[PDB]
Amino acid sequence: RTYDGDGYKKRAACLCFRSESEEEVLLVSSSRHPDRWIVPGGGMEPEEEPSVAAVREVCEEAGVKGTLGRLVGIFENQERKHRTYVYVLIVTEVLEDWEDSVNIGRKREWFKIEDAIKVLQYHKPVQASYFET
Ligand SMILES: O=P(O)(O)O[C@H]1[C@H](OP(=O)(O)O)[C@@H](OP(=O)(O)O)[C@H](OP(=O)(O)O)[C@@H](OP(=O)(O)O)[C@H]1OP(=O)(O)O
Ligand SMILES: [Cl-]
Numbered sequence: 681r682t683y684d685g686d687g688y689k690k691r692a693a694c695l696c697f698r699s700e701s702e703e704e705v706l707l708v709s710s711s712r713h714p715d716r717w718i719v720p721g722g723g724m725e726p727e728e729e730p731s732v733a734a735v736r737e738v739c740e741e742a743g744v745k746g747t748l749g750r751l752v753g754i755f756e757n758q759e760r761k762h763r764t765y766v767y768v769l770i771v772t773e774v775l776e777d778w779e780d781s782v783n784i785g786r787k788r789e790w791f792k793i794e795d796a797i798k799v800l801q802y803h804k805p806v807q808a809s810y811f812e813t
């Protein structure tokens with residue numbers, strides 16, 4: 681784990697869209713509660729560029745690759761004390777077996793943006809806020 685100077689854990693995530701239309705996004709199941717959905721992401725490694733961490737974490741958690749787009753923003757979770765760089769990724773490769781499918785049976789599913797916001801709101805309101813702009 682790595683940390684900013686204020687002790688917030690450093691993370692990176694992508695909004696994994698099907699196409700440049702940015703109408704449908706890939707969510708993955710929570711590791712702690714597999715009936716819940718989250719935005720794929722995780723901790724930056726030492727000296728790891730946030731854009732590199734973002735692409736690595738979505739490969740590990742969601743089993744997708746594609747064309748990295750813009751930084752959306754940097755989002756804090758005050759309760760859990762972490763700070764996440766959130767990028768757009770346009771998915772062009774969908775892998776059948778991936779690290780978290782094999783290791784913990786993690787699931788993935790496409791959502792219309794409005795539906796992603798709905799399923800994130802209760803447990804992950806900061807991740808719902810990723811989609812606001
Ligand atoms: O403690 P939990 O409710 O099970 O949540 C954990 C925890 O996130 P929080 O920091 O928000 O509590 C993990 O981070 P750590 O506490 O272990 O540093 C995080 O791991 P990442 O930051 O590496 O993503 C993990 O996510 P996951 O196992 O999906 O990678 C996530 O679990 P959820 O899947 O339920 O969000
Ligand atoms: Cl799309």
Ligand SMILES: [Cl-]
Nearest residue numbers: 757804806807
């Ligand atoms: Cl969060």
Ligand SMILES: [Mg+2]
Nearest residue numbers: 721722723741
């Ligand atoms: Mg993670």
Ligand SMILES: [Mg+2]
Nearest residue numbers: 721722737741
């Ligand atoms: Mg991870």
Ligand SMILES: [Mg+2]
Nearest residue numbers: 721722723737
């Ligand atoms: Mg992790």
